[PDB]
Design an enzyme around this catalytic site. Structure first.
Site, PDB file in Angstrom:
ATOM      1  N   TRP B 300       0.814  -1.209   0.000  1.00 51.12           N
ATOM      2  CA  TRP B 300       0.000   0.000   0.000  1.00 51.12           C
ATOM      3  C   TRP B 300       0.850   1.262   0.000  1.00 51.12           C
ATOM      4  CZ3 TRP B 300      -0.931   4.036   3.500  1.00 51.12           C
ATOM      5  CH2 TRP B 300      -0.196   3.973   4.687  1.00 51.12           C
ATOM      6  N   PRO B 303       7.204   3.784  -0.813  1.00 54.35           N
ATOM      7  CA  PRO B 303       8.339   4.496  -0.195  1.00 54.35           C
ATOM      8  C   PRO B 303       8.720   3.982   1.186  1.00 54.35           C
ATOM      9  CG  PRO B 303       6.956   6.049  -1.306  1.00 54.35           C
ATOM     10  CD  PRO B 303       6.248   4.734  -1.407  1.00 54.35           C
ATOM     11  N   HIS B 305       7.898   1.138   2.527  1.00 55.11           N
ATOM     12  CA  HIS B 305       8.309  -0.258   2.437  1.00 55.11           C
ATOM     13  C   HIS B 305       9.757  -0.374   1.986  1.00 55.11           C
ATOM     14  CE1 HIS B 305       8.376  -4.480   1.877  1.00 55.11           C
ATOM     15  NE2 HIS B 305       8.269  -4.452   0.562  1.00 55.11           N
ATOM     16  N   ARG B 327      10.672  -8.214  12.448  1.00 53.28           N
ATOM     17  CA  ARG B 327       9.261  -7.893  12.261  1.00 53.28           C
ATOM     18  C   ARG B 327       8.686  -7.214  13.497  1.00 53.28           C
ATOM     19  NH1 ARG B 327       7.175 -13.713  10.319  1.00 53.28           N
ATOM     20  NH2 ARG B 327       8.261 -14.157  12.292  1.00 53.28           N
ATOM     21  N   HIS B 338       2.661   5.957  14.615  1.00 54.77           N
ATOM     22  CA  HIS B 338       1.224   6.199  14.679  1.00 54.77           C
ATOM     23  C   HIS B 338       0.883   7.091  15.864  1.00 54.77           C
ATOM     24  CE1 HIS B 338      -3.036   4.580  13.896  1.00 54.77           C
ATOM     25  NE2 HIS B 338      -3.143   5.505  14.831  1.00 54.77           N
ATOM     26  N   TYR B 400     -13.212  16.460  18.012  1.00 56.60           N
ATOM     27  CA  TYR B 400     -14.217  17.367  17.470  1.00 56.60           C
ATOM     28  C   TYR B 400     -15.342  17.612  18.461  1.00 56.60           C
ATOM     29  CZ  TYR B 400     -18.259  18.852  14.761  1.00 56.60           C
ATOM     30  OH  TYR B 400     -19.375  19.512  14.308  1.00 56.60           O
TER      31      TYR B 400
HETATM   32  C1  LIG Z   1       0.603   7.864   6.660  1.00 56.25           C
HETATM   33  C2  LIG Z   1      -0.335   8.634   5.761  1.00 56.25           C
HETATM   34  C3  LIG Z   1      -1.606   7.871   5.440  1.00 56.25           C
HETATM   35  C4  LIG Z   1      -2.533   8.590   4.470  1.00 56.25           C
HETATM   36  C5  LIG Z   1      -3.764   7.786   4.084  1.00 56.25           C
HETATM   37  C6  LIG Z   1      -3.441   6.410   3.524  1.00 56.25           C
HETATM   38  C7  LIG Z   1      -4.648   5.649   2.997  1.00 56.25           C
HETATM   39  C8  LIG Z   1      -4.323   4.261   2.444  1.00 56.25           C
HETATM   40  C9  LIG Z   1      -5.455   3.679   1.655  1.00 56.25           C
HETATM   41  C10 LIG Z   1      -6.277   2.717   2.021  1.00 56.25           C
HETATM   42  C11 LIG Z   1      -6.265   1.966   3.310  1.00 56.25           C
HETATM   43  C12 LIG Z   1      -6.723   2.793   4.504  1.00 56.25           C
HETATM   44  C13 LIG Z   1      -5.642   2.955   5.556  1.00 56.25           C
HETATM   45  C14 LIG Z   1      -5.235   1.649   6.214  1.00 56.25           C
HETATM   46  C15 LIG Z   1      -3.961   1.749   7.027  1.00 56.25           C
HETATM   47  C16 LIG Z   1      -3.901   2.979   7.911  1.00 56.25           C
HETATM   48  C17 LIG Z   1      -2.687   2.983   8.826  1.00 56.25           C
HETATM   49  C18 LIG Z   1      -2.329   4.389   9.220  1.00 56.25           C
HETATM   50  O1  LIG Z   1      -2.703   5.362   8.619  1.00 56.25           O
HETATM   51  S1  LIG Z   1      -1.270   4.478  10.623  1.00 56.25           S
HETATM   52  C19 LIG Z   1      -0.640   6.180  10.502  1.00 56.25           C
HETATM   53  C20 LIG Z   1       0.843   6.198  10.823  1.00 56.25           C
HETATM   54  N1  LIG Z   1       1.606   5.278   9.991  1.00 56.25           N
HETATM   55  C21 LIG Z   1       1.981   4.072  10.408  1.00 56.25           C
HETATM   56  O2  LIG Z   1       1.697   3.637  11.520  1.00 56.25           O
HETATM   57  C22 LIG Z   1       2.777   3.249   9.425  1.00 56.25           C
HETATM   58  C23 LIG Z   1       1.910   2.246   8.696  1.00 56.25           C
HETATM   59  N2  LIG Z   1       2.695   1.301   7.914  1.00 56.25           N
HETATM   60  C24 LIG Z   1       3.326   1.642   6.790  1.00 56.25           C
HETATM   61  O3  LIG Z   1       3.369   2.797   6.376  1.00 56.25           O
HETATM   62  C25 LIG Z   1       3.984   0.514   6.002  1.00 56.25           C
HETATM   63  O4  LIG Z   1       3.023  -0.149   5.197  1.00 56.25           O
HETATM   64  C26 LIG Z   1       4.857  -0.516   6.765  1.00 56.25           C
HETATM   65  C27 LIG Z   1       5.745   0.210   7.779  1.00 56.25           C
HETATM   66  C28 LIG Z   1       3.963  -1.528   7.490  1.00 56.25           C
HETATM   67  C29 LIG Z   1       5.749  -1.273   5.790  1.00 56.25           C
HETATM   68  O5  LIG Z   1       6.534  -2.244   6.495  1.00 56.25           O
HETATM   69  P1  LIG Z   1       6.734  -3.716   5.893  1.00 56.25           P
HETATM   70  O6  LIG Z   1       5.582  -4.584   6.205  1.00 56.25           O
HETATM   71  O7  LIG Z   1       7.012  -3.533   4.410  1.00 56.25           O
HETATM   72  O8  LIG Z   1       8.067  -4.296   6.538  1.00 56.25           O
HETATM   73  P2  LIG Z   1       8.643  -5.779   6.562  1.00 56.25           P
HETATM   74  O9  LIG Z   1       8.156  -6.536   7.731  1.00 56.25           O
HETATM   75  O10 LIG Z   1      10.158  -5.676   6.436  1.00 56.25           O
HETATM   76  O11 LIG Z   1       8.111  -6.419   5.212  1.00 56.25           O
HETATM   77  C30 LIG Z   1       8.876  -7.286   4.349  1.00 56.25           C
HETATM   78  C31 LIG Z   1       8.166  -8.611   4.247  1.00 56.25           C
HETATM   79  O12 LIG Z   1       8.911  -9.496   3.380  1.00 56.25           O
HETATM   80  C32 LIG Z   1       9.334 -10.632   4.111  1.00 56.25           C
HETATM   81  N3  LIG Z   1      10.658 -11.033   3.645  1.00 56.25           N
HETATM   82  C33 LIG Z   1      11.280 -12.225   3.910  1.00 56.25           C
HETATM   83  N4  LIG Z   1      12.468 -12.341   3.368  1.00 56.25           N
HETATM   84  C34 LIG Z   1      12.642 -11.140   2.697  1.00 56.25           C
HETATM   85  C35 LIG Z   1      13.699 -10.634   1.916  1.00 56.25           C
HETATM   86  N5  LIG Z   1      14.833 -11.301   1.677  1.00 56.25           N
HETATM   87  N6  LIG Z   1      13.552  -9.402   1.385  1.00 56.25           N
HETATM   88  C36 LIG Z   1      12.424  -8.728   1.626  1.00 56.25           C
HETATM   89  N7  LIG Z   1      11.365  -9.101   2.347  1.00 56.25           N
HETATM   90  C37 LIG Z   1      11.535 -10.324   2.859  1.00 56.25           C
HETATM   91  C38 LIG Z   1       9.277 -10.235   5.585  1.00 56.25           C
HETATM   92  O13 LIG Z   1       9.109 -11.380   6.411  1.00 56.25           O
HETATM   93  C39 LIG Z   1       8.025  -9.367   5.567  1.00 56.25           C
HETATM   94  O14 LIG Z   1       6.837 -10.176   5.424  1.00 56.25           O
HETATM   95  P3  LIG Z   1       6.015 -10.867   6.634  1.00 56.25           P
HETATM   96  O15 LIG Z   1       5.465  -9.721   7.491  1.00 56.25           O
HETATM   97  O16 LIG Z   1       6.906 -11.788   7.392  1.00 56.25           O
HETATM   98  O17 LIG Z   1       4.830 -11.592   5.987  1.00 56.25           O
END
Ligand SMILES: CCCCCCCC/C=C\CCCCCCCC(=O)SCCNC(=O)CCNC(=O)[C@H](O)C(C)(C)COP(=O)(O)OP(=O)(O)OC[C@H]1O[C@@H](n2cnc3c(N)ncnc32)[C@H](O)[C@@H]1OP(=O)(O)O
Ligand SMILES: CCCCCCCCCCC(CCCCCCCCCC)(CO[C@@H]1O[C@H](CO)[C@@H](O[C@H]2O[C@H](CO)[C@@H](O)[C@H](O)[C@H]2O)[C@H](O)[C@H]1O)CO[C@@H]1O[C@H](CO)[C@@H](O[C@H]2O[C@H](CO)[C@@H](O)[C@H](O)[C@H]2O)[C@H](O)[C@H]1O
Ligand SMILES: CCCCCCCCCCC(CCCCCCCCCC)(CO[C@@H]1O[C@H](CO)[C@@H](O[C@H]2O[C@H](CO)[C@@H](O)[C@H](O)[C@H]2O)[C@H](O)[C@H]1O)CO[C@@H]1O[C@H](CO)[C@@H](O[C@H]2O[C@H](CO)[C@@H](O)[C@H](O)[C@H]2O)[C@H](O)[C@H]1O
Ligand SMILES: CCCCCCCC/C=C\CCCCCCCC(=O)SCCNC(=O)CCNC(=O)[C@H](O)C(C)(C)COP(=O)(O)OP(=O)(O)OC[C@H]1O[C@@H](n2cnc3c(N)ncnc32)[C@H](O)[C@@H]1OP(=O)(O)O
Ligand SMILES: CCCCCCCCCCCCCCCCCC(=O)OC[C@H](COP(=O)(O)OC[C@H](N)C(=O)O)OC(=O)CCCCCCCCCCCCCCCCC
Ligand SMILES: CCCCCCCCCCCCCCCCCC(=O)OC[C@H](COP(=O)(O)OC[C@H](N)C(=O)O)OC(=O)CCCCCCCCCCCCCCCCC
Ligand SMILES: CCCCCCCCCCCCCCCCCC(=O)OC[C@H](COP(=O)(O)OC[C@H](N)C(=O)O)OC(=O)CCCCCCCCCCCCCCCCC
Ligand SMILES: CCCCCCCCCCCCCCCCCC(=O)OC[C@H](COP(=O)(O)OC[C@H](N)C(=O)O)OC(=O)CCCCCCCCCCCCCCCCC
Ligand SMILES: CCCCCCCC/C=C\CCCCCCCC(=O)O[C@@H](COC(=O)CCCCCCCCCCCCCCC)COP(=O)([O-])OCC[N+](C)(C)C
Ligand SMILES: CCCCCCCC/C=C\CCCCCCCC(=O)O[C@@H](COC(=O)CCCCCCCCCCCCCCC)COP(=O)([O-])OCC[N+](C)(C)C
Lengths: 404, 404
Positions: B300, B303, B305, B327, B338, B400
């Site tokens: 989603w 950047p 990620h 993780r 957050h 609000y």
């Molecule tokens: C912020 C502005 C928002 C504006 C509006 C947006 C609307 C969006 C539209 C529609 C949905 C509605 C909104 C729903 C959500 C709302 C949430 C908030 O707003 S909270 C507000 C504050 N912000 C946060 O708190 C951060 C939220 N998170 C993020 O921004 C990211 O998505 C984040 C940090 C979660 C990305 O982290 P990763 O999940 O990519 O990190 P890793 O765990 O390293 O992922 C890599 C995966 O690949 C595997 N992997 C394994 N081997 C690997 C390898 N060799 N290389 C790479 N990956 C490997 C790993 O095991 C992992 O997967 P495995 O979790 O285990 O399933």
């Protein structure tokens, strides 16, 4: 480890990306509809289904059948079916002359078209929604019998020189399986599915019921109040008022037609094909991705397109004629059937449907010669809103005002 | 000519078809939005834009700057930027000890995080919507400076053994181009677009304005009346009332978040990248086609990620640690940010966001271990409606109500 990770790309939503996979949007629409209308659908389903008494209505029809003309017509269509079958069975064995068989088939088809129209225009006791069902049944029967006689003629002409040959395909089982099958092109060996999927049938029936409730709600809560704002007929009314009123109805009418398409061409036809174990389930193609009007007209209804191509277009080309003449013939036949299906069940003959189908031509030329890419698709989506659905909405609105 | 034309298939909408091209649905949504809201958008655009006086507000800020804390913070971020740049430039030439440079960079980053939070929690004259912008600017600056110092450290360690080498990439031009670029991963050679497309910029600006008007309309006409039905805080309220009220707001809040995503990650970032001639425009992937929560969390936001993978996950794995620990670290950092971005600008510290992010885990396990195909995608779409957006809506609603 200073190596790079960026590379020239483009976002998925931009048209230069070439991305196409958008099934998530469809699942989102489904989830939103369910979450919004599940309580109301369940309430109405309980309420109505607790009144399900099919034996009651069947007995009622059995007490006095001469008072329900529409089911009597839907039943009497079998007489024409059996007549065509008998003509064919005599043509196979019986040495009936091919010219006599052709004349009898032409008479049968002309009667198939002319009898329900006469019974509808003459009997004033028939409702304008059972009349439409009778006329649709007889149109479909006409097309299917045309295809039947054509394929049997081809096989007979061939015979003069797991699988079934020609003379052993003339049985009531096969004929009636064809008559109820969701296709308009006759074959001797249909492709079959391995088994009947009960979960598939359940989901299709649920979709049918849900979209029926949704359409009734849409009508009775969005279009009936808007019509009742000023109840006047579209005839004898200034063009300014006509357009001002059509602007308020163009959107809900479009949604109604979309729900019609989905619950008719996807759920109903798949339920029938699943009950019958019909193999080919290509009832439509990606008309929503059309970039010109011709692509949409070709891909929105595959049964009728197959019929026109196999029995009307290509036979006309093989006998010698320019493509322009065959296209004009298809246009005139479609206009005639639009009239037959809209004007007759309402007994209202105006010039709206004809001029709509006419103005569809320069619009098609313009969309083809000016727009391309996503703008062509937007132009097609806009032409669907102010196109033929408007010409049908005018008829239905005038009838609802004049008659209630 | 009795040859066949039917063959085993399945309708396009059925999941067994493997069909994916649904751009027509997107064009339909766009056309419907335009047809429905064009008059209102044009009216509001004329009305507001005839009041455009940027010189007025700039002069007003110039008369008394100490009364507008948010732009003062957004301006003072440049001090930390220049401090990090000076540390790096001295590390390249100047023989500054690498441990001293690491300590100074850690101090700079800790100050980048701690200063806006302190100024916000201490100065009560700052609005809770300029506070969010200042906190977002400082979070983005923190991540970008982390990446900057990391990449320069890699290049320096390498040096001990059309294109730019290491020591000639330390300039204010390059640093500030990176600071305004729509990416969080630093590189020495960014991919560039050939030219600035003016029609592209115009369409992106129009999308931004239109979706801004649409979101304001949605809020002020759907969620403010629903809130004003019974103005009470979510704190000190029975759980039954809380759920009963959240059921009426779950849908418009979801639509608001969808519009946020589109107008922020597609239109705004593409407008910035087009103004800057930024090459890589992969700011998101097909998260709407996700069949499990992990795919959605990965795709989603590209950047963040990329940042987590390149600077937080993989460096932690290369130093020796199980994937579970990394993780957990990412989860804790996301929870902290957050909090930093929601609780601080509202000065409201509750346990809602934390338990939401926590309950996101067993939901993910369940959706992964029970659903598949389109049902997994439906479960993900349903988890987006009752997931984290609800935990942010509770905060915003309570604020609000308590403050107006
Ligand atoms: C912020 C502005 C928002 C504006 C509006 C947006 C609307 C969006 C539209 C529609 C949905 C509605 C909104 C729903 C959500 C709302 C949430 C908030 O707003 S909270 C507000 C504050 N912000 C946060 O708190 C951060 C939220 N998170 C993020 O921004 C990211 O998505 C984040 C940090 C979660 C990305 O982290 P990763 O999940 O990519 O990190 P890793 O765990 O390293 O992922 C890599 C995966 O690949 C595997 N992997 C394994 N081997 C690997 C390898 N060799 N290389 C790479 N990956 C490997 C790993 O095991 C992992 O997967 P495995 O979790 O285990 O399933
Ligand atoms: C995507 C498009 C979204 C459009 C949403 C329109 C919502 C809607 C349709 C009702 C649908 C009912 C479905 C029942 C399903 C049952 C299973 C609610 O319809 C409203 O329903 C109320 C009763 O609930 C009724 O009172 C209102 O008159 C009626 O408008 C119509 O809303 C408004 O109606 C106005 C009438 O002039 C119309 O002008 C507005 O343009 C329209 O926005
Ligand atoms: C797909 C989903 C479709 C949902 C459509 C909902 C239409 C809607 C949102 C207004 C959007 C304005 C956009 C402005 C854009 C400007 C650029 C019209 O909103 C209506 O706007 C009227 C003014 O026009 C106002 O009067 C009504 O109170 C308000 O409901 C809300 O409709 C209804 O509001 C009700 C309030 O209780 C709510 O209960 C209903 O569930 C909702 O259906
Ligand atoms: C009916 C129930 C409806 C339920 C609700 C549906 C909702 C749908 C959903 C959403 C849209 C909203 C609704 C919009 C529309 C409403 C209209 C009505 O409801 S009117 C009601 C009455 N019915 C009609 O009046 C018939 C309407 N028409 C049809 O059913 C068909 O689509 C039809 C008859 C138009 C199909 O005919 P062809 O266009 O396929 O026929 P050819 O001209 O032979 O097409 C073949 C093309 O290929 C070329 N071609 C060239 N060489 C060829 C070759 N060798 N082989 C094949 N083709 C070749 C030909 O030149 C031609 O293309 P070249 O027109 O020239 O661009
Ligand atoms: C299959 C699951 C079906 C769940 C149905 C739940 C009961 C129905 C229900 O809660 O309807 C309420 C909403 C539907 O929103 P919408 O009509 O605008 O709602 C506004 C409307 N005027 C209202 O005030 O109600 O409902 C919602 O918005 C529901 C959103 C959350 C659903 C959570 C389901 C899992 C728990
Ligand atoms: C945007 C939504 C509206 C799209 C265009 C709608 C045009 C409506 C329009 O101008 O109708 C005009 C005609 C309807 O005439 P009718 O009553 O015999 O004759 C009028 C008579 N003289 C009268 O006094 O009233 O109607 C016609 O001639 C055809 C009606 C429209 C059919 C679809 C046109 C698509 C282009
Ligand atoms: C870019 C083109 C923009 C065209 C804007 C035309 C003026 C606006 C206009 O006609 O709004 C009216 C409708 C928008 O429907 P929606 O809000 O439910 O309408 C019901 C609403 N309550 C109403 O009574 O108005 O508008 C429509 O439904 C428009 C449908 C036909 C558009 C035809 C455009 C080409 C001619
Ligand atoms: C369907 C839409 C609704 C989804 C689930 C919403 C659950 C709401 C719920 O039960 O909140 C409950 C708590 C909020 O407690 P807080 O005021 O300290 O404590 C309650 C206090 N004792 C009181 O008297 O009121 O709230 C929490 O503990 C977390 C709130 C929900 C966060 C998202 C959960 C997703 C699953
Ligand atoms: C009349 C003018 C033409 C109208 C048709 C559009 C053609 C132009 C076009 O493709 O514009 C743009 C696409 O635009 C989008 O992708 C917008 C989609 C918005 C959907 C709602 C938010 C979806 C959030 C997410 C989905 C969640 C689910 C949402 C479910 C609803 C692309 O055009 P361009 O790159 O500027 O042009 C390049 C040349
Ligand atoms: C909770 C239960 C699960 C919910 C998610 C659905 C999963 C199941 C599924 O895919 O069902 C069905 C799809 O269904 C459709 O394609 C319906 C789409 C309707 C869209 C509105 C009409 C579109 C008309 C036309 C577009 C015009 C534009 C419309 C623009 C809005 C398929 O499932 P199945 O084949 O029964 O299952 C096989 C196993």
């Amino acid at each position: 480890w200073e190596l790079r990770c960026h590379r020239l790309q483009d976002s998925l939503f931009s048209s230069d990306s070439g991305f196409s996979n958008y099934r998530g949007i469809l699942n989102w629409c489904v989830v939103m509809l369910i979450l919004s209308n599940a309580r109301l659908f369940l309430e109405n389903l309980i309420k109505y289904g607790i009144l399900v008494d099919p034996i009651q209505v069947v007995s009622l029809f059995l007490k006095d059948p001469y008072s329900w003309p529409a089911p009597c017509l839907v039943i009497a269509a079998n007489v024409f079916a059996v007549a065509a079958f008998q003509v064919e069975k005599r043509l196979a064995v019986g040495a009936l002359t091919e010219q006599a068989g052709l004349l009898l088939h032409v008479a049968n088809l002309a009667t198939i078209l002319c009898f329900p129209a006469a019974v509808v225009l003459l009997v004033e006791s028939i409702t304008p929604v059972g009349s439409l069902l009778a006329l649709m049944a007889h149109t479909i029967l006409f097309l299917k019998l045309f295809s039947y006689r054509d394929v049997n003629s081809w096989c007979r002409r061939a015979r003069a020189k797991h699988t079934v040959s020609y003379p052993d395909n003339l049985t009531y089982r096969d004929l009636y399986y064809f008559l109820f099958a969701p296709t308009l092109c006759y074959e001797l060996n249909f492709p079959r599915s391995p088994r009947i999927r009960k979960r598939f049938l359940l989901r299709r029936i649920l979709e049918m019921l849900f979209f029926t409730q949704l359409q009734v709600g849409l009508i009775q809560q969005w279009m009936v109040p808007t019509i009742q704002n000023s109840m006047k007929p579209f005839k004898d009314m200034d063009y300014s008022r006509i357009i001002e009123r059509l602007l308020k109805l163009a959107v809900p009418n479009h949604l109604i037609w979309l729900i019609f398409f989905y619950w008719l061409f996807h759920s109903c036809l798949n339920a029938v094909a699943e009950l019958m174990q019909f193999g080919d389930r290509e009832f439509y193609r990606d008309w929503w991705n059309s970039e010109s009007v011709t692509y949409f007209w070709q891909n929105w209804n595959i049964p009728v397109h197959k019929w026109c191509i196999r029995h009307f277009y290509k036979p006309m080309l093989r006998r010698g004629s320019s493509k322009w003449m065959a296209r004009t013939g298809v246009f005139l036949a479609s206009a005639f059937f639009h009239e037959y299906l809209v004007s007759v069940p309402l007994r209202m003959f105006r010039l709206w449907a004809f001029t709509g189908m006419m103005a569809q031509i320069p619009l098609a030329w313009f969309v083809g010669r000016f727009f391309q890419g996503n703008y062509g698709n937007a132009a097609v989506w806009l032409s669907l809103i102010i196109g033929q659905p408007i010409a049908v909405l005018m008829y239905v609105h005038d009838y609802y005002v004049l008659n209630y």
